[PDB]
Structure formats: C-alpha cells, structure tokens
C-alpha cells in the first residue's frame, strides 16, 4: 500500500515507471502516476 | 543532475538501492543515502 518514493525506498524496494519487473511483488506506487513499488522475489 | 525520485522516474528511470542492475546504467541518484537512478542506455 506504498503510495510515495521515500516510504518505497526506504524499505530496500524498488521505484519502476510502469512496471514491475519479471518475479518482483506490486506493493505499490512510487507516486508518479504510472510507477511502481517493487518488492524482491 | 538527478537527485530526487521524481526527477528519476520522470525521466523514465528506475530508482534501486545501493546498486544498478544488470543491462541498466547509473544517469543520477534518488536523492536517499545509496539510492541510484538507473535507465538501460
């Protein structure tokens, strides 16, 4: 339920701009319309 | 240059901690303590 840059990177995650690559977990947004919080497999 | 998240994903970019993977290069940071903006060239 990530929602902006900081809370996702903090956490050791990861911002994408669209979407989250192959075998990562959607958590999020990074808050720009469209990007992604992607958590490791 | 690109020292912020949003500056980061704006341009297309991805925001990782501490490293670049594979295939992507470092252009910038995400402005948090090892965080690295990162786009495939």
């Not at 050791?12 to 989250?20: D, K, Q, R, S």
């Amino acid at each position: 339920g990530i929602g902006d840059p900081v809370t996702c990177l903090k956490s050791g995650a990861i911002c994408h701009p669209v979407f989250c690559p192959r075998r990562y977990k959607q958590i999020g947004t990074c808050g720009l319309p469209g990007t992604k919080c992607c958590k490791k497999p």
